[PDB]
Amino acid sequence: MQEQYRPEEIESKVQLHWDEKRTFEVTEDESKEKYYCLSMLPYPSGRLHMGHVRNYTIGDVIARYQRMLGKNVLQPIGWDAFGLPAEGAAVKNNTAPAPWTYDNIAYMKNQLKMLGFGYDWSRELATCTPEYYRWEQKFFTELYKKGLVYKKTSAVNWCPNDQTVLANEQVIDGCCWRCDTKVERKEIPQWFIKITAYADELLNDLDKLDHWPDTVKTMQRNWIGRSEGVEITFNVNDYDNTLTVYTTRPDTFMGCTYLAVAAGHPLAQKAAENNPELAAFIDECRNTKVAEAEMATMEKKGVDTGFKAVHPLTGEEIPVWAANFVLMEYGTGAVMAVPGHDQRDYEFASKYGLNIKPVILAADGSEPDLSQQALTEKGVLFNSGEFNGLDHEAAFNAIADKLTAMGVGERKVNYRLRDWGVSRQRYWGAPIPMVTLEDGTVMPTPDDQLPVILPEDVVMDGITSPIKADPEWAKTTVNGMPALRETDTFDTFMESSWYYARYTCPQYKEGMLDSEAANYWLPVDIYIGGIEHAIMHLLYFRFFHKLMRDAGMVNSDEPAKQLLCQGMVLADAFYYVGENGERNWVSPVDAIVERDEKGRIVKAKDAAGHELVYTGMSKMSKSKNNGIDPQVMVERYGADTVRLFMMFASPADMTLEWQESGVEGANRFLKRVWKLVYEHTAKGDVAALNVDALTENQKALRRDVHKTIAKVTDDIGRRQTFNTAIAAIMELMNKLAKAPTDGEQDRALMQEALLAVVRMLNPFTPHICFTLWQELKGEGDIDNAPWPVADEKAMVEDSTLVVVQVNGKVRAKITVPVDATEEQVRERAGQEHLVAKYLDGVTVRKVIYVPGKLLNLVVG
RNA sequence: GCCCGGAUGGUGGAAUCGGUAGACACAAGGGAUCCCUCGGCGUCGCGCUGUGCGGGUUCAAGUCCCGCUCCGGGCACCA
Ligand SMILES: CC(C)[C@@H](O)[C@H](O)C(=O)NP(=O)(O)OC[C@@H]1C[C@H](O)[C@H](n2cnc3c(N)ncnc32)O1
Ligand SMILES: [Mg+2]
Ligand SMILES: [Mg+2]
Ligand SMILES: [Mg+2]
Ligand SMILES: [Mg+2]
Ligand SMILES: [Mg+2]
Ligand SMILES: [Zn+2]
């Protein structure tokens, strides 16, 4: 053993050993309890960043821990390889997306290997390969045939010049990120999967997920947004079509004083034929961008349509207004307004002079003051004809029943959750296996024509997808007739929704899943990812799991028993605007920055002299060029130091503002462990430890080793606070460095301790541990060593520390036999001069005794 | 705007079930790879104060409640 710890002479040697022994390659071994430890697969943007490093270290820590408990652990890795970033990057770099992606995969695979994550490389998948996506295509066709897929018109950001569909990220201030002109909404026919058919199940099964955090379960409930209400239909006077609204507040219905209607509503359109203010307004609205955040912050605006709906119950004509905040796609395109009791409606009505009609009494039974704002509280009705005096429940029911009897209303369940738009009009994605025949009929691509392969050998131009530009490509024949294949491609969450199941049988050719292998490994025991994916991805993932259950592909109702959503790793993000409009994102490594007394960035320049817009600390990201690559730290300090640092900096669930400073802590600590092992083992073999004949000083030390094993075990296995586990190991290491090591018992004890420390560290820093384990003459390779177990007999204590407070303020700390009464603790407490000092002249009014821990004498 | 989080020393963080605030480290300063000091203010072998800010509940709040400021995640085409 070398005196000096040299990660360059260790890490690659140990990685080579795992590659060659196939250490982490697993099969469906029925002799072992499985454990499936899954980390959210990487998108191959080119480099890892520290967000990746935290995700996969947490996951590797757990997979190694579970292996040491004797489990057969599948920890798989793969690439979520389709998507937008490959398209811009290929244009700019004069490549195609495929070759760019596969190069990023190779680079990034090498970085993963160099961090030493124990992945089963034999199960490596890339989602952009037809061996993968053929299965989701077949599955889609089966989903369409079972009536779970439909086509409708949906809004897309449209650049009228380039004639491109843009993602929201590419829309910058309602103008493009290429040339400059106003992006507009274009309604476009697209495919949707009826995730709403599973809304209730998705909502309800949250109650089974006892090992998913409440943050994620609440965000998902609120996203699905299930509601119980009433749909109501209105006639409109010089108009041949009815108008339907949904409300969850039918009780306030007599207070409905106007309807609002989406700029694109046929009623608005008709009215626009005879009204120039209106026409101009509808046309302003085509440049309302599709993004809920923008819908909800924009100044709310309306023009009167001149049409009047008839309130079904009161009979009065109420105005129909066209509004910039109501969308045709997200319901019936019409909403009803109750400005007396909805603050948003109140604001609109105040702005426009519409009737604000009160129908709920104030808390005292008087008519409410609506001069400043709405009375939003549920209450007793008045000014509501036959419904006066009813409360919320009863008014809901009475008004619902009446409208139903009249044939203009029905009780309806509503969800905020919309169906899943899975169409994209980009090239770099899996082709949607649908076809239009010469006939005009549309159908799934026939089975013998699956997969529909995306050609990878392409010339890109940024504007048009090659499969859309090549005329021949879409041509096929179906039912003996000419047909055109769909040139849209799948939303990439399609591939990431089922990868976890495909990792169980990635080389299986006869079907999407080998259910035998799927049912050995599933469900995922723990799914490690960022909080970023708490909603969209996790919901889609749960849904897809239920879809496959309903195809009889899987046993479980849910895909993942436990979920560990780490906080995001953040880094400062910067950009300057390029001379033709476009944001150029500069790495924080390259920004020159001046800082506040509070640490806040206050000026920011790139080295080229550009003035950088500082956007804040935000998730390390492919898109914002703010991802910090670990390569240089791994090369300087070693993978083990980087991994320990990441696990040490913060507990997984906190969000982390990345900084390199602090690494010296991990690195120096690893050098101390190395030194201690070196010094111990330079001395040779140890005698068997004689427990019954230990000193008190030796007993004490042995207690702390075992107390450290128990705590570390709890911290990793129950709390997932890795940072505190590592701190416990450091504390123990600090005691062990001051332990004498002359005698045989002292050395026997140090052997036991070090064998314990090196195993407890192995998940975090496995290359050094693998090596040290050998120096200690541990049995076998550490990857297979049992996790140390604490012995209860070694950690008994007859004494306990009691803090003594007077009036909540610590005045003494005393040691107290564990059998001590309160009365004896009092007396012992009285013996301390700093307790007597605050008791002289006063009366103890109340004693609080937390047995074995605290005495608060409340005095005066 | 809406949903979910968050704020503890110069810095990352610890306090797990309401019970010693600042473990463990980094950085910096001092002393000889190691030891020391290290929130702030002032009988220091003492005392007061202090967990973003404003209030509550409680013998007791970093923890629970209400509110405010600032900050992150998501908001359906970033993945
Ligand atoms: C499962 C699927 C939808 C995702 O995995 C998607 O392919 C993706 O996001 N890939 P990624 O950005 O490479 O990052 C891979 C994972 C996702 C997870 O949130 C984590 N991650 C990504 N970025 C961060 C980050 N900044 N902080 C903390 N964690 C981060 O690594
Ligand atoms: Mg902090
Ligand atoms: Mg602070
Ligand atoms: Mg306390
Ligand atoms: Mg102090
Ligand atoms: Mg405070
Ligand atoms: Zn443009």
Side-chain angles (χ1 to χ4, degrees):
Chain A
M1 179 167 29
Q2 226 303 319
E3 179 171 12
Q4 215 186 105
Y5 166 52
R6 274 187 203 109
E8 70 275 21
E9 281 159 22
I10 285 178
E11 291 179 352
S12 67
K13 175 177 161 145
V14 172
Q15 285 155 19
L16 177 70
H17 166 95
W18 296 323
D19 282 8
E20 272 188 332
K21 306 318 195 150
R22 301 174 185 267
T23 310
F24 299 99
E25 308 211 329
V26 300
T27 52
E28 291 67 56
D29 188 350
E30 276 300 357
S31 81
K32 275 200 182 193
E33 169 165 28
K34 66 101 176 161
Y35 187 101
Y36 187 176
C37 186
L38 173 67
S39 292
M40 290 192 172
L41 80 174
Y43 179 88
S45 50
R47 291 305 96 114
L48 292 171
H49 56 58
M50 308 304 313
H52 294 125
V53 180
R54 196 178 191 210
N55 208 100
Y56 308 139
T57 296
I58 292 171
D60 203 40
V61 158
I62 292 170
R64 290 176 181 274
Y65 167 67
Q66 293 289 346
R67 175 179 274 242
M68 290 171 95
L69 299 173
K71 282 150 192 194
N72 185 28
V73 175
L74 168 77
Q75 205 201 176
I77 188 70
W79 310 96
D80 178 15
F82 273 131
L84 220 211
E87 295 220 355
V91 170
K92 156 132 190 295
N93 287 6
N94 223 27
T95 350
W100 176 92
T101 302
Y102 296 124
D103 274 310
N104 296 344
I105 287 173
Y107 200 94
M108 289 174 75
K109 186 186 189 166
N110 182 236
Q111 294 194 284
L112 294 172
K113 285 198 175 166
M114 283 182 77
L115 284 156
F117 298 136
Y119 289 131
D120 184 348
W121 289 101
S122 78
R123 291 156 194 271
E124 183 181 13
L125 296 168
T127 61
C128 53
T129 62
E131 304 70 52
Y132 186 81
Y133 69 70
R134 63 178 288 178
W135 300 114
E136 80 186 14
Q137 294 177 329
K138 170 93 177 82
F139 198 67
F140 187 82
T141 70
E142 297 177 10
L143 254 31
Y144 177 88
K145 279 189 263 239
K146 286 181 184 149
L148 283 172
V149 172
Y150 66 103
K151 186 163 225 168
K152 71 164 190 279
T153 260
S154 181
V156 140
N157 309 294
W158 183 247
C159 189
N161 297 281
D162 311 333
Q163 301 176 14
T164 303
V165 171
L166 302 165
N168 288 335
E169 193 191 52
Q170 310 182 281
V171 176
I172 285 157
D173 306 8
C175 198
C176 185
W177 81 347
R178 280 186 210 89
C179 55
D180 282 349
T181 227
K182 258 158 204 188
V183 181
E184 54 203 81
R185 303 168 74 82
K186 174 163 184 155
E187 297 286 327
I188 272 190
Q190 283 175 107
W191 295 105
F192 284 80
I193 302 166
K194 291 189 204 160
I195 192 155
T196 55
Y198 289 68
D200 289 330
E201 162 155 35
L202 285 165
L203 193 64
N204 292 314
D205 283 354
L206 290 165
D207 309 325
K208 298 171 183 153
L209 295 171
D210 46 279
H211 298 277
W212 281 43
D214 287 339
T215 43
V216 174
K217 294 190 296 211
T218 305
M219 282 191 282
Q220 289 195 11
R221 315 205 159 77
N222 290 341
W223 178 267
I224 298 166
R226 181 183 196 268
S227 207
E228 290 159 37
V230 177
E231 257 175 26
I232 296 177
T233 292
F234 294 73
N235 302 309
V236 186
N237 264 333
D238 305 298
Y239 190 62
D240 295 0
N241 294 350
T242 62
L243 224 33
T244 301
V245 297
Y246 174 76
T247 172
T248 51
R249 285 303 296 270
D251 51 292
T252 63
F253 186 50
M254 308 296 274
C256 165
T257 68
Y258 65 93
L259 303 184
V261 96
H265 197 289
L267 187 145
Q269 291 270 121
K270 179 79 188 179
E273 295 167 334
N274 332 114
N275 189 350
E277 191 197 353
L278 183 44
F281 181 82
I282 291 166
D283 295 357
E284 181 216 84
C285 296
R286 288 180 236 147
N287 295 53
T288 302
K289 164 172 153 185
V290 268
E292 194 193 52
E294 291 221 352
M295 283 318 93
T297 313
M298 45 168 27
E299 195 206 299
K300 319 214 152 169
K301 287 185 192 180
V303 183
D304 183 346
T305 218
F307 287 111
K308 311 271 167 204
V310 180
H311 201 291
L313 291 179
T314 66
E316 72 192 299
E317 288 178 281
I318 71 171
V320 184
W321 277 60
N324 64 346
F325 52 85
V326 176
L327 266 61
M328 206 60 37
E329 300 167 38
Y330 316 149
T332 65
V335 294
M336 52 160 267
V338 179
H341 315 288
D342 184 279
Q343 188 49 32
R344 200 194 65 165
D345 296 342
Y346 185 93
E347 282 161 347
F348 191 86
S350 299
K351 194 189 166 179
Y352 289 115
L354 303 180
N355 186 23
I356 307 165
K357 181 180 177 195
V359 296
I360 305 301
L361 290 176
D364 54 3
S366 74
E367 295 163 17
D369 198 342
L370 307 183
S371 64
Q372 331 255 243
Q373 55 170 322
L375 179 70
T376 251
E377 293 88 304
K378 296 167 174 188
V380 180
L381 293 201
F382 78 119
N383 195 24
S384 295
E386 68 182 294
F387 307 106
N388 290 337
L390 300 175
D391 60 42
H392 171 72
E393 279 283 82
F396 187 109
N397 297 318
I399 288 171
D401 289 332
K402 193 81 149 199
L403 290 173
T404 301
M406 295 167 63
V408 299
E410 44 168 61
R411 285 179 222 248
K412 178 128 274 280
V413 175
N414 186 86
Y415 305 94
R416 195 202 101 113
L417 182 72
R418 304 194 299 259
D419 292 327
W420 175 11
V422 309
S423 290
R424 295 284 181 279
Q425 20 310 134
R426 273 181 244 133
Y427 152 75
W428 190 235
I432 293 181
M434 289 292 98
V435 103
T436 305
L437 320 197
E438 185 145 291
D439 264 353
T441 62
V442 173
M443 61 179 289
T445 309
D447 272 14
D448 71 351
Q449 285 178 53
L450 294 185
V452 185
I453 293 171
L454 186 75
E456 302 192 329
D457 211 46
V458 294
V459 170
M460 295 262 295
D461 69 349
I463 300 169
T464 338
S465 148
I467 58 186
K468 294 175 179 297
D470 184 19
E472 296 288 47
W473 185 86
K475 292 198 139 190
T476 184
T477 144
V478 176
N479 302 336
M481 80 187 91
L484 295 184
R485 36 201 162 214
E486 175 66 71
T487 56
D488 279 10
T489 60
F490 277 127
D491 169 13
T492 76
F493 278 128
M494 192 79 44
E495 296 85 64
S496 70
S497 291
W498 71 283
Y499 74 105
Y500 72 93
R502 183 60 177 182
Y503 277 149
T504 72
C505 53
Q507 290 315 118
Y508 188 58
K509 307 296 180 177
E510 293 177 350
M512 175 166 187
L513 297 188
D514 174 0
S515 269
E516 202 65 0
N519 284 319
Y520 177 93
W521 286 115
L522 288 181
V524 178
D525 286 278
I526 194 150
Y527 192 17
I528 306 94
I531 195 63
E532 72 171 325
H533 289 299
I535 305 184
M536 276 177 83
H537 166 65
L538 290 181
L539 221 50
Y540 290 152
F541 154 88
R542 288 179 63 217
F543 174 57
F544 213 100
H545 185 87
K546 297 173 192 292
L547 283 170
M548 292 187 291
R549 179 202 60 205
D550 297 343
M553 297 161 63
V554 288
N555 285 148
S556 35
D557 296 315
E558 282 300 319
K561 316 227 226 177
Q562 184 170 337
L563 173 68
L564 189 45
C565 269
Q566 48 148 358
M568 303 308 280
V569 179
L570 313 173
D572 283 332
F574 308 86
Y575 75 86
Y576 65 92
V577 170
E579 286 168 77
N580 192 64
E582 178 179 3
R583 299 182 185 181
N584 292 268
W585 290 92
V586 175
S587 184
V589 166
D590 290 301
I592 305 138
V593 125
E594 178 174 297
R595 286 189 183 268
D596 243 19
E597 278 215 59
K598 309 103 181 194
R600 312 183 73 217
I601 288 172
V602 123
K603 304 191 198 204
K605 261 194 168 218
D606 77 1
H610 292 121
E611 197 81 63
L612 303 182
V613 175
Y614 175 51
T615 63
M617 268 268 179
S618 65
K619 79 194 194 174
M620 282 192 183
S621 176
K622 27 170 177 263
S623 301
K624 284 178 166 211
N625 204 17
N626 66 333
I628 292 275
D629 185 352
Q631 210 48 37
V632 174
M633 290 175 69
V634 173
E635 285 172 9
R636 205 83 204 81
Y637 298 106
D640 281 348
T641 294
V642 175
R643 298 167 52 127
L644 195 67
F645 183 53
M646 285 293 337
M647 298 300 88
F648 187 60
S650 207
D653 78 348
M654 271 194 226
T655 105
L656 172 63
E657 302 193 351
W658 163 264
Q659 42 162 205
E660 176 156 10
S661 102
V663 249
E664 230 67 303
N667 189 242
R668 295 193 282 241
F669 169 71
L670 293 177
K671 301 204 293 175
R672 294 195 293 279
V673 168
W674 188 276
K675 188 176 161 188
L676 194 54
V677 176
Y678 174 80
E679 272 157 2
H680 172 69
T681 58
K683 286 153 151 167
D685 296 340
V686 307
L689 179 64
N690 196 342
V691 187
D692 73 47
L694 293 161
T695 321
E696 300 313 311
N697 318 292
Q698 291 171 334
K699 147 175 165 136
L701 178 58
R702 194 160 183 269
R703 201 213 301 113
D704 297 330
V705 172
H706 292 245
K707 278 173 81 167
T708 306
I709 293 158
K711 162 152 183 53
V712 168
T713 293
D714 195 46
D715 285 353
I716 292 188
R718 183 178 64 87
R719 300 166 73 214
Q720 304 113 40
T721 66
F722 299 170
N723 51 322
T724 64
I726 289 162
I729 299 169
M730 284 175 127
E731 288 163 58
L732 184 61
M733 272 304 300
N734 290 341
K735 291 164 179 192
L736 290 174
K738 295 162 190 134
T741 62
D742 316 280
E744 292 215 275
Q745 288 278 80
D746 289 322
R747 299 203 55 242
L749 196 56
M750 177 71 50
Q751 180 71 4
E752 176 191 357
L754 286 179
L755 282 169
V757 164
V758 168
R759 289 180 282 163
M760 281 187 288
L761 251 12
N762 178 56
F764 304 101
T765 56
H767 310 80
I768 191 169
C769 292
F770 183 108
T771 303
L772 295 168
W773 179 256
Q774 294 181 341
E775 306 302 318
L776 286 161
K777 296 182 177 182
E779 286 188 344
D781 290 354
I782 197 166
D783 313 299
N784 306 318
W787 183 255
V789 175
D791 178 1
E792 303 298 338
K793 304 181 219 198
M795 40 198 190
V796 181
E797 303 191 48
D798 306 333
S799 62
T800 179
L801 189 152
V802 171
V803 173
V804 180
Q805 288 175 337
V806 181
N807 279 331
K809 289 166 147 200
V810 178
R811 302 302 187 184
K813 297 172 197 186
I814 64 171
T815 290
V816 145
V818 138
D819 60 276
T821 67
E822 182 188 310
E823 298 65 49
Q824 289 167 316
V825 166
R826 287 221 61 182
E827 184 248 61
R828 175 72 191 76
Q831 304 188 349
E832 298 290 304
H833 76 293
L834 289 193
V835 170
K837 179 187 190 188
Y838 291 91
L839 291 178
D840 238 353
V842 294
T843 309
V844 176
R845 303 178 193 180
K846 184 187 187 81
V847 186
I848 300 296
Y849 180 48
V850 183
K853 268 160 191 174
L854 177 141
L855 186 68
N856 189 39
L857 299 164
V858 178
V859 107

